[PDB]
DNA sequence: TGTCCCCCGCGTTTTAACCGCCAAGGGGATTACTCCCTAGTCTCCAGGCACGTGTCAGATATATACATCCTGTTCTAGAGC
DNA sequence: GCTCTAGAACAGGATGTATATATCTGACACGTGCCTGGAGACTAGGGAGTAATCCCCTTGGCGGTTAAAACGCGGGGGACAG
């Protein structure tokens, strides 16, 4: 399945901005944050799939994902 | 047709989504987007539920922090509405 | 104690790449620091990869995954190509 | 007498300080500042010349990058001058 | 007194290297303060590194490790 | 500072997400067993580290040429008598 | 129709960066004098590979229901500037 960048809906972006304390949200920022979320996701996902392919592993586990997040200096607690 | 001010409900939603820790992006579209992104790297790749969960938590946290930085850029520029130039400036400051 | 230096190695690499281009002592120190920093980064990533799946050894695949994790894009692809060509020439 | 417009001398200084890598910060004041800072942690503490050089290079590169981010924020705010609020915003985004 | 030992033209040259056209008059003190904070952090790390080695002089080498452990690695030393 | 375009707030629909249960087939974990490849040690020799030194790449510098800024000036257009 | 004010563009002079040697100390790198460190080769048993289930768990399939997203709509807000 392709064209899934539209899955991150505009109200979901608005909720993310409200959590960030944003009062006024432009209509042109939704494409930009979809782009940056996509870029961050390709970075983390490519690190995760390199971790997965290193260990003869075919399904991506939660451990590798958080290890990738930590090696990009964005360590995630709770997994 | 009682109508609230355009900017009071914004602050109310800010308070509601800052007090609560429930996730904002729905799990199914984020999972589908993750599979779409990963299908260009490994063919027929499987994602466990906790992996997608952790990826979602990290992605929402990164987006939230970037949104605070862009909002701070907006107030720094004597502005309220965020614009993609704020996102570009925030990304380039951290060298992303 | 004595301190290792990669002056001759970087020198011969440069002469293989540019046979008629010199290099200063400060640039030699910069190159040394760069190669040591990349060595430490790749070795740490490979050690983390080995510890990740309860492996007590570091093989060529560990360095391969470390390079793919650290080096981005076409730089990573060319590094894997050069490493694979070196291993195939060894065998 | 000859008069130059405000900016062309600034642009010439930008160019001449970006082509060359001379030491902008003088050796003695930076060395004295380093000794003053270190004297509060450890008394009778020495600094070799290459250590002072290295610390000065790292500090100068860090301050140049911070000034680049400060100018970036100033242009984002449609401003030519760089204000302390710009430095504060750049450090806050950089988490310093 | 060495905090003011660094000069306003030095800060101007530093901003010129950073591609800044003009500098406001009240940013010099802020730049001096943030420079003092950065130097305090790096010097604290270098002091801990020097004290760990039973050494009374801060060499250049543990300084570049102090900078590198902060994500600001230094080359040439 | 005025304003006309841009974003926000209820209304409506619809639209897909969350949920409840189950087949089900590819995939992570470790036990029995084996293997070839890896730590350690004996000897040493060709790659490698440290001191001497010729000089040519680079650094500092005067003088002189091409390039841009500027002030002087000549000319032509247009208002006044 | 005659007299005269003022804007406009090259003309030469001033100044700036830059090439061209002039030269000069200065360390780049070969030569050499050693020199320490892994190359060659047993010794062998510990980690990795192969399998061998094994399960397990994540993908997909029946929908049901409903919170939420997309659709314009309306008036207020305010972003981009002179």
UniProtKB/Swiss-Prot annotation, chain A:
Q: Which residues carry this modification: N6-acetyllysine?
A: 10, 38, 58, 70
Q: Which residues form the Glycyl lysine isopeptide (Lys-Gly) (interchain with G-Cter in UFM1) crosslink?
A: 10
Cite the GO molecular-function annotations of the record.
DNA binding; protein heterodimerization activity; structural constituent of chromatin
N6-(2-hydroxyisobutyryl)lysine found at: 10, 23, 38, 56, 58, 70
Keyword Metal-binding included in the entry's annotation = no
Give residue numbers for the modification (N6-butyryllysine): 10, 23, 56, 58, 70
- Where Phosphoserine occurs, the residues are 26
Q: Name one GO cellular component term.
A: nucleosome
Q: According to its UniProt record, how is this protein modified after translation?
A: Demethylation is performed by JMJD6.
Instruction: According to the UniProt record, list the residues that bear N6-glutaryllysine.
Output: 10, 38, 56, 58, 70
Top-level division of the source organism's lineage: Eukaryota
Q: Phosphotyrosine (modified residue): where?
A: 30, 67
Q: Which UniProt keywords apply?
A: Acetylation, Chromosome, Citrullination, DNA-binding, Hydroxylation, Isopeptide bond, Methylation, Nucleosome core, Nucleus, Phosphoprotein, Ubl conjugation
Q: Where is this cross-link: Glycyl lysine isopeptide (Lys-Gly) (interchain with G-Cter in ubiquitin)?
A: 70
N6-propionyllysine, modified sites: 10, 23, 56, 58, 70
> N6-lactoyllysine (modified residue): where?
10, 56, 70
The PTM N6-succinyllysine maps to 10, 56, 70
Q: Does the keyword Acetylation apply?
A: yes
Q: What is any one GO biological process for this UniProt entry?
A: nucleosome assembly
Q: How does it assemble?
A: The nucleosome is a histone octamer containing two molecules each of H2A, H2B, H3 and H4 assembled in one H3-H4 heterotetramer and two H2A-H2B heterodimers. The octamer wraps approximately 147 bp of DNA.
- Explain the purpose of this protein: Core component of nucleosome. Nucleosomes wrap and compact DNA into chromatin, limiting DNA accessibility to the cellular machineries which require DNA as a template. Histones thereby play a central role in transcription regulation, DNA repair, DNA replication and chromosomal stability. DNA accessibility is regulated via a complex set of post-translational modifications of histones, also called histone code, and nucleosome remodeling.
Family classification: Belongs to the histone H4 family.
Name of the protein in question? Histone H4
User: What organism is this sequence from?
Assistant: Xenopus laevis
UniProtKB/Swiss-Prot annotation, chain C:
Which superkingdom?
A: Eukaryota
Q: How is it modified after translation?
A: Monoubiquitination of Lys-89 by BRE1 gives a specific tag for epigenetic transcriptional activation and is also prerequisite for histone H3 'Lys-4' and 'Lys-79' methylation. GlcNAcylation at Ser-81 promotes monoubiquitination of Lys-89. It fluctuates in response to extracellular glucose, and associates with transcribed genes.
Keywords (alphabetical) are: Acetylation, Chromosome, DNA-binding, Glycoprotein, Isopeptide bond, Nucleosome core, Nucleus, Phosphoprotein, Ubl conjugation
Q: Which residues cross the membrane?
A: none
Q: Which cysteines are joined by disulfide bonds?
A: none
> Cellular component per GO?
nucleosome; nucleus
Glycosylation sites recorded in the entry for this protein? 81
Write out the GO MF terms. DNA binding; protein heterodimerization activity; structural constituent of chromatin
Q: Where is this cross-link: Glycyl lysine isopeptide (Lys-Gly) (interchain with G-Cter in ubiquitin)?
A: 89
- Compartment(s) of residence: Nucleus; Chromosome
Q: Name the protein family.
A: Belongs to the histone H2B family.
Assembly with partners or alone: The nucleosome is a histone octamer containing two molecules each of H2A, H2B, H3 and H4 assembled in one H3-H4 heterotetramer and two H2A-H2B heterodimers. The octamer wraps approximately 147 bp of DNA.
Q: What does this protein do?
A: Core component of nucleosome. Nucleosomes wrap and compact DNA into chromatin, limiting DNA accessibility to the cellular machineries which require DNA as a template. Histones thereby play a central role in transcription regulation, DNA repair, DNA replication and chromosomal stability. DNA accessibility is regulated via a complex set of post-translational modifications of histones, also called histone code, and nucleosome remodeling.
> Per its record, how is this protein called by name?
Histone H2B 1.1
User: What is the covered span of the full protein?
Assistant: 33 to 123 of 126
Swiss-Prot record, chain E:
Q: How is it modified after translation?
A: Demethylation is performed by JMJD6. Monomethylation is performed by KMT5A/SET8. Trimethylation is performed by KMT5B and KMT5C and induces gene silencing.
Q: Find the cross-link Glycyl lysine isopeptide (Lys-Gly) (interchain with G-Cter in ubiquitin).
A: 68
Modified-residue entries (Phosphotyrosine), positions: 28, 65
Residue positions, PTM N6-lactoyllysine: 8, 54, 68
Residues annotated as carrying N6-succinyllysine in the record are 8, 54, 68
In this UniProt entry, the residues modified to N6-glutaryllysine are: 8, 36, 54, 56, 68
Source organism, top-level taxon: Eukaryota
Residues with N6-acetyllysine modification: 8, 36, 56, 68
Give residue numbers for the modification (N6-propionyllysine): 8, 21, 54, 56, 68
**Modification sites for N6-(2-hydroxyisobutyryl)lysine:** 8, 21, 36, 54, 56, 68
Phosphoserine found at: 24
Q: Where in the cell is it found?
A: Nucleus; Chromosome
Summarizing the function annotation, the protein's role is: Core component of nucleosome. Nucleosomes wrap and compact DNA into chromatin, limiting DNA accessibility to the cellular machineries which require DNA as a template. Histones thereby play a central role in transcription regulation, DNA repair, DNA replication and chromosomal stability. DNA accessibility is regulated via a complex set of post-translational modifications of histones, also called histone code, and nucleosome remodeling.
Subunit info here reads: The nucleosome is a histone octamer containing two molecules each of H2A, H2B, H3 and H4 assembled in one H3-H4 heterotetramer and two H2A-H2B heterodimers. The octamer wraps approximately 147 bp of DNA.
Quote the protein name from its UniProt record: Histone H4
Biological classification of the source:
Eukaryota, Metazoa, Chordata, Craniata, Vertebrata
Q: Which residues of the full protein are shown?
A: 25 to 101 of 103
């Amino acid at each position: 399945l392709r064209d899934n960048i539209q899955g991150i809906t505009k109200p979901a972006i608005r909720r993310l901005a409200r959590r960030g304390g944003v009062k006024r949200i432009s209509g042109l920022i939704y494409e930009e944050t979809r782009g940056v979320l996509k870029v961050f996701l390709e970075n983390v996902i490519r690190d995760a799939v390199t971790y997965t392919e290193h260990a003869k592993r075919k399904t991506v586990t939660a451990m590798d994902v958080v290890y990738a997040l930590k090696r990009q200096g964005r360590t995630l607690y709770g997994f | 047709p009682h109508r609230y001010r355009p900017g009071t409900v914004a602050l109310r939603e800010i308070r509601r989504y800052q007090k609560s820790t429930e996730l904002l992006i729905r799990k199914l579209p984020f999972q589908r987007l993750v599979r779409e992104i990963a299908q260009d790297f490994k063919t027929d790749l499987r994602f466990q539920s906790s992996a997608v969960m952790a990826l979602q938590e990290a992605s929402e946290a990164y987006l939230v922090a970037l949104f605070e930085d862009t909002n701070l850029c907006a107030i720094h520029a004597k502005r309220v509405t965020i614009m993609p130039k704020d996102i570009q400036l925030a990304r380039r400051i951290r060298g992303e | 104690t004595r301190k290792e230096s990669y002056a001759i190695y970087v020198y011969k690499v440069l002469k293989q790449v540019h046979p008629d281009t010199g290099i200063s002592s400060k640039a030699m120190s910069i190159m040394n620091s760069f190669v040591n920093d990349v060595f430490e980064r790749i070795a740490g990533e490979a050690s983390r990869l080995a510890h990740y799946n309860k492996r007590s050894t570091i093989t060529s695949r560990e360095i391969q995954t470390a390079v793919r994790l650290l080096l981005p894009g076409e730089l990573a692809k060319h590094a894997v190509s050069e490493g694979t060509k070196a291993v195939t020439k060894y065998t």
